Amino acid sequence: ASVDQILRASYRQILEKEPQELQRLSVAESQLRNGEISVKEFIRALGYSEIYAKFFLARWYNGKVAEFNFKHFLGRQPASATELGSHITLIGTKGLKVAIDTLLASQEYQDNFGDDTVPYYRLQAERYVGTTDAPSRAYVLARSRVQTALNKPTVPSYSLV
Amino acid sequence: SAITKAILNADAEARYLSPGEIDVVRGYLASGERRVRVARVLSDNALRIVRGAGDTMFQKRPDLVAPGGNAYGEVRTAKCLRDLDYFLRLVTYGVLAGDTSPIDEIGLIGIKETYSLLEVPVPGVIDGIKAAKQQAAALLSSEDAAEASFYFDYVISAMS
Amino acid sequence: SAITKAILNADAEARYLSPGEIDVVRGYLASGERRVRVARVLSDNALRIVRGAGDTMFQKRPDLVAPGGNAYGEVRTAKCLRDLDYFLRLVTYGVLAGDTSPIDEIGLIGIKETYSLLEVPVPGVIDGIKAAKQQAAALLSSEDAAEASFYFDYVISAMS
Amino acid sequence: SAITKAILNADAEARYLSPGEIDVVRGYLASGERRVRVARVLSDNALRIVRGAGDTMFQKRPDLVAPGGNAYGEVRTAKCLRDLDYFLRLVTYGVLAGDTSPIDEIGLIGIKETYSLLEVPVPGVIDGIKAAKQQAAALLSSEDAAEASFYFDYVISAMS
Amino acid sequence: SAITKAILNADAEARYLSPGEIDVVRGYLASGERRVRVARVLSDNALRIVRGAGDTMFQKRPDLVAPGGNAYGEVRTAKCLRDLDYFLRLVTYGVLAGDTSPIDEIGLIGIKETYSLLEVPVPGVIDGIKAAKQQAAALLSSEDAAEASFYFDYVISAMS
Amino acid sequence: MLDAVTKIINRTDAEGRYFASKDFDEVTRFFATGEARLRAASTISANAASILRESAAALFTEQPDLLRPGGNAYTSRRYAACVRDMEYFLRYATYALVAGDTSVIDERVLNGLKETYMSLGVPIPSTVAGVTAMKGVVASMIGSEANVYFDHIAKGLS
Amino acid sequence: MLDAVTKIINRTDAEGRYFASKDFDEVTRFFATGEARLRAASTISANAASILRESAAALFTEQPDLLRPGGNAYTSRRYAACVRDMEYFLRYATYALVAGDTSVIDERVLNGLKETYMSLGVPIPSTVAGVTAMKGVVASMIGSEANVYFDHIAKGLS
Amino acid sequence: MQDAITSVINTYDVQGKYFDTSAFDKLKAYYATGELRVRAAGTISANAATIIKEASAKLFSNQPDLVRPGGNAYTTRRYAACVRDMDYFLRYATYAMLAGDTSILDERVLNGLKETYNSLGVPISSTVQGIQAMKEVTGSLVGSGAAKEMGVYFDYLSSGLS
Ligand SMILES: CCC1=C(C)/C(=C/C2=NC(=C\c3[nH]c(/C=C4\NC(=O)[C@H](C)[C@H]4CC)c(C)c3CCC(=O)O)/C(CCC(=O)O)=C2C)NC1=O
Ligand SMILES: CCC1=C(C)/C(=C/C2=NC(=C\c3[nH]c(/C=C4\NC(=O)[C@H](C)[C@H]4CC)c(C)c3CCC(=O)O)/C(CCC(=O)O)=C2C)NC1=O
Numbered sequence A: 001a002s003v004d005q006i007l008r009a010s011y012r013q014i015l016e017k018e019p020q021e022l023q024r025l026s027v028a029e030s031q032l033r034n035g036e037i038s039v040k041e042f043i044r045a046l047g048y049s050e051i052y053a054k055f056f057l058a059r060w061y062n063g064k065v066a067e068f069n070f071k072h073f074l075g076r077q078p079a080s081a082t083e084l085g086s087h088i089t090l091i092g093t094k095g096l097k098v099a100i101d102t103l104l105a106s107q108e109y110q111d112n113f114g115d116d117t118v119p120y121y122r123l124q125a126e127r128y129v130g131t132t133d134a135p136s137r138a139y140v141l142a143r144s145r146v147q148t149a150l151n152k153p154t155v156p157s158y159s160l161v
Numbered sequence B, C, D, E: 001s002a003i004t005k006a007i008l009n010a011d012a013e014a015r016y017l018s019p020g021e022i023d024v025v026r027g028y029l030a031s032g033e034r035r036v037r038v039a040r041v042l043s044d045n046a047l048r049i050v051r052g053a054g055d056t057m058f059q060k061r062p063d064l065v066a067p068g069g070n071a072y073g074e075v076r077t078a079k080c081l082r083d084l085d086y087f088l089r090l091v092t093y094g095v096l097a098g099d100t101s102p103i104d105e106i107g108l109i110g111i112k113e114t115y116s117l118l119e120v121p122v123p124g125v126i127d128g129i130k131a132a133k134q135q136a137a138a139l140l141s142s143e144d145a146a147e148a149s150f151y152f153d154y155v156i157s158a159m160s
Numbered sequence F, G: 001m002l003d004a005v006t007k008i009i010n011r012t013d014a015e016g017r018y019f020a021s022k023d024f025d026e027v028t029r030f031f032a033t034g035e036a037r038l039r040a041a042s043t044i045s046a047n048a049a050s051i052l053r054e055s056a057a058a059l060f061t062e063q064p065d066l067l068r069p070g071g072n073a074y075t076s077r078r079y080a081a082c083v084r085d086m087e088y089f090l091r092y093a094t095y096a097l098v099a100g101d102t103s104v105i106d107e108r109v110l111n112g113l114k115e116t117y118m119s120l121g122v123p124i125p126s127t128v129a130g131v132t133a134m135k136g137v138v139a140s141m142i143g144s145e146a147n148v149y150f151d152h153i154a155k156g157l158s
Numbered sequence H: 001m002q003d004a005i006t007s008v009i010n011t012y013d014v015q016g017k018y019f020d021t022s023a024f025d026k027l028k029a030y031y032a033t034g035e036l037r038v039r040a041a042g043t044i045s046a047n048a049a050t051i052i053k054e055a056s057a058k059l060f061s062n063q064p065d066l067v068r069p070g071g072n073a074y075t076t077r078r079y080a081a082c083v084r085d086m087d088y089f090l091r092y093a094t095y096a097m098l099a100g101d102t103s104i105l106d107e108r109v110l111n112g113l114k115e116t117y118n119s120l121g122v123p124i125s126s127t128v129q130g131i132q133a134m135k136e137v138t139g140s141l142v143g144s145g146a147a148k149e150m151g152v153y154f155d156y157l158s159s160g161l162s
């Protein structure tokens, strides 16, 4: 893929917007184009942005923030109460950036996307069986999230789990 | 199909169809009547091709129907011939669509695991598909045989 | 070119060329001689298309060459017709290549930022490229007119 | 050849070549390059064609090379492969001559008596020649393969 | 190995060995004599197990050594026996290690696509390994046979 | 997504049968109209900006209260989101017109759009009025060929 | 990556000049040989498994030591990686054969490959022998049409 | 014998006229089907022995009394003559298909055949059944258009006998 395709895909995957709507990360984009940072480092630059906190934390409850982080950086949804609660605790005690770092350093991320692919959803049972403690629930939540990908659901996070 | 791939490529860049993608679509729409002719020929001779391919496969590789063979018996041989017919219908779909997506979605995705579980000898399946390719190329002209062989070879490569 | 797009698609999926991409390549190679004819007639007459389009653009909006305008002055008009010649050459490149890529790498990626910094009116450039499309179709047959018009319209659309 | 057959015909009625016979000779001389190409491909690839045909024939009919078989032993297997090579070279002659006369003269007249008395299974020879025909068709285009298949099936039908 | 697996499990959480991990390592160290005994019996009877398993496989699936089979020919049957001996050596490795890592990283990872490309019938390999399992069970006592059967079964499951 | 040919293929596959005479007739009918649909798509692509401009003009002439303070299209951001939505509708209607099947609109446009509009307070009847204005513009420009696809978007919101 | 038409376009663009008669002639020469190159590529694609099998057989018959214990091809995994690399070379040779230009090889295959083989311990001369074997295999089927690209891969390795 | 071209020629000679548009349409129609006929004839010639084996096997399965003692096809000589006659029917149908005209079937086959078979005691209904068996077997080899063409001549033979 070209750097342009990677950039547009990253902006849609992480910030749910096209690049023209946003103030682009010019230096991060230049570093990716020059090839001294990976796609993963650009994804983390998008997560670290103040625009990410404005979009997905300023006007949201921490459970919604956890769901947003799982959709953006893993391509799925939190399946159990333990996983969602652990991520909420990470956000509420260490900050948004440390939670995003935990998502990026996870073995799940390394296996599915590694260092050069933009994250994406995968509605397959192999996606969740080994990785998730509630695989069927993980599939149900991921499929519902993909079904209405345009929407930012306001259904309570712990009602889904 | 051929149109779907162009439309998805345009959607990747969030733009309308480019002159190249429109050239692709126009070429496919031009090939449509030739595709319909070939697909109809392979459809009317479905029993033709299936019996010819099955006889060629069983003569080439008789251990399939020999005792202890996977297709031993009238029922298992009938299911083997039905699989050959399945792949023939999928070749017709691939000819009509202009790409291989119907073949993958209906027949190729998961067939390797399925046959591995069933201990279905994939080389024998390749023999059957190649025999069906020869049978169909017999019933077509040179050109029509060329495009039919395109999807027959795609099926052969995907199985192997 | 049209070949590069197909090869990129095959490379992305890590596989050999599919029947559809082979069909695309065959179509492009079949169209090559018409492409060369259209590109040659566009090249041989570049001066007259540039002159006519520049004239029409200037009359359609005098404020461009009026004092306080972006193209006011002799040097800025020379750069104006140089840009028109550039875009015509990229249109010929796109006709030859069978896709719009050379137009993208050479002329249109970054043209929006450049023209916004230089305070170049994009509607003025679009009127110039439109005038160029009329001048080009003026000396083309209908099929060649449409073939060039696809790329002229692509340039216009990407300009806005 | 075709020329010889037309000359023999005209000589039986003690006349010069008629318009039909001139057409036959002219159409044969026209096909010369195609016949030479086909014969070159079959000749230069005789070794791999015979190896492949023999492998296919022995897999299809193991009892031939099993103890008590007509081809059992290194010498008898070598003569079996030599017979397959003979028939391939006769097919090349038939392609070059544009008729089956050299095949009849050198290989076919008496081959039934020969194989009956040597106890050589004619169906096995037919299987080997069919295998050689497919191996040749692998190496030739559709038209060239169709040209060679005429003489291959002529040999097969003379066997049967 | 078992110790390697426990140490990696400790390292992933950046901690010293857990009491459960210590129990795993201790139980592994206790089984050392039994593992050496099983492996020594297997290695001393390597040729006997290989011959018996190969013979059993070859009557069970005579299509393999039959003409047209994947193992027909002295070179190919020798390579078949050599792979059986390879998997026997790997089974000894697994018995000594207390884990299946040597089996995976020497012979199991990549054998699936390797045998797919070589058209090696995996069911035949599985029958050969099961025959080797029977040979080992004959040479070993019940407990030793069960311990070796763990890794024989692991290889069987990995192949399928 | 599907196009017309893949839709016919799926229909014949659900029944497990080869293509019959009627199926080939339908596929041929689709191939026959392909040149006209490509012309319509190219015509729309050439004037997408002007179609969008006059479609937004029509929408906000019919309902000026959307632009006024307190309206759902009053800010630069919300006006931009509105015209971006209309641009989406035009582009994906063009995609569907090329494909001859509306599944692209289901996959890429209506995947949670009605829920999104109910959640954000976007007025759905006003959006349908805008979609209808764009349908009328495109119909006057190329003919009736695309009407159904726009109606599909309307039915996805209504 | 480039192809023949794109490299010609780049050459004319560096000089900022319209296409001349020589440029058009070179383009027409590329267009003329298109069908033969496509047929060769299709033949290679249809026979990829057999080409891999017989090229690996030739390589490991010429150099058995790679398959013995201690050889860089001694495992199921290292043998699989070897035939996988041969598949890389064949597929990208087909790509360059269709394109008519070797830049895809330089970018997708030869970019950092020599240093990677040094880092891994892969014997480069044996890999070159494998590429030459596959050259012979492909020449036995399609003729000398694809010899240039395999030679380019070999020289890049060497 | 008479083929389609010489059939047109004979009509126009007897009426003494040069060819007109209608004659040229008949001749174009014959020439257009020529490649299909040549292909079918080559396929039948390559497969004639197989066609006869299959058809005789189906006939003698459907009527086992023919080859058992007391049947007209009971001896090596009478079995050989039976399949020889089947070789006739296949070969002459192939001739008539290649010529596109049934005149050769009248001249070379059907004339006096009922009388020969009735004098010999050869059962004609079973012979028609064998001709039908060859029709299906040949159609199984040659494909739709060639099968439809060859079936015309097989049915002509069946009608001439039955
Ligand atoms: C670990 C526990 C677990 C389970 C059990 C599980 C089930 C499961 N089955 C699925 C699909 C499926 N499952 C089935 C199985 C059904 N077909 C019918 O004929 C049978 C009665 C029945 C099986 C006996 C089928 C056919 C699909 C495909 C559905 C589709 O693609 O539309 C999917 C969607 C993802 C995929 O296709 O891989 C899941 C998540 N997931 C899990 O994480
Ligand atoms: C150039 C024209 C020509 C032909 C056609 C020809 C055929 C031929 N093959 C022969 C023997 C043979 N031919 C075969 C071949 C058979 N082995 C298997 O059964 C197969 C079914 C089959 C071949 C595919 C074998 C095994 C023999 C040796 C038999 C014996 O020694 O008794 C012989 C007897 C003399 C001899 O040993 O060479 C002749 C004349 N000779 C000629 O000079």
Ligand SMILES: CCC1=C(C)/C(=C/C2=NC(=C\c3[nH]c(/C=C4\NC(=O)[C@H](C)[C@H]4CC)c(C)c3CCC(=O)O)/C(CCC(=O)O)=C2C)NC1=O
Residues within 6 Å of the ligand: E064, E070, E071, E076, E077, E079, E080, E081, E083, E084, E086, E087, E106, E107, E108, E111, E114, E118, E120, E121, E122, E124, E125, E128, G067, G073, G074, G075, G076, G079
């Ligand atoms: C130490 C780890 C290791 C393993 C596991 C291994 C398996 C292995 N077996 C091979 C060939 C082979 N393998 C077999 C064995 C199979 N075919 C028979 O039919 C049986 C069903 C079955 C055995 C029970 C045969 C016959 C070949 C020869 C294929 C050929 O060379 O054409 C090859 C290809 C390289 C070569 O021919 O030497 C590998 C890599 N190699 C390794 O270095």
Ligand SMILES: CCC1=C(C)/C(=C/C2=NC(=C\c3[nH]c(/C=C4\NC(=O)[C@H](C)[C@H]4CC)c(C)c3CCC(=O)O)/C(CCC(=O)O)=C2C)NC1=O
Residues within 6 Å of the ligand: A150, A151, F066, F072, F073, F077, F078, F079, F081, F082, F083, F085, F086, F088, F108, F109, F113, F116, F120, F122, F123, F126, F127, F128, F130, F131
């Ligand atoms: C490519 C597929 C796609 C579609 C279809 C799409 C529609 C879409 N429109 C949205 C908001 C919106 N949509 C509108 C448009 C409405 N304003 C009303 O006055 C009009 C009647 C009406 C339009 C005709 C507005 C104003 C918003 C902003 C809502 C807000 O910020 O409160 C949103 C919420 C997120 C955002 O604003 O970026 C989506 C997802 N987005 C997509 O990615």
Ligand SMILES: CCC1=C(C)/C(=C/C2=NC(=C\c3[nH]c(/C=C4\NC(=O)[C@H](C)[C@H]4CC)c(C)c3CCC(=O)O)/C(CCC(=O)O)=C2C)NC1=O
Residues within 6 Å of the ligand: H060, H067, H068, H073, H074, H075, H076, H079
């Ligand atoms: C009175 C003179 C006479 C004879 C002898 C005769 C033989 C004869 N054998 C037949 C079948 C057969 N005959 C045999 C005999 C063969 N099996 C082995 O190969 C052996 C070498 C050999 C016997 C020793 C076989 C196997 C068949 C069945 C063949 C088939 O249907 O494919 C048939 C076909 C119809 C039927 O099955 O009844 C005839 C007519 N017919 C006659 O009118």
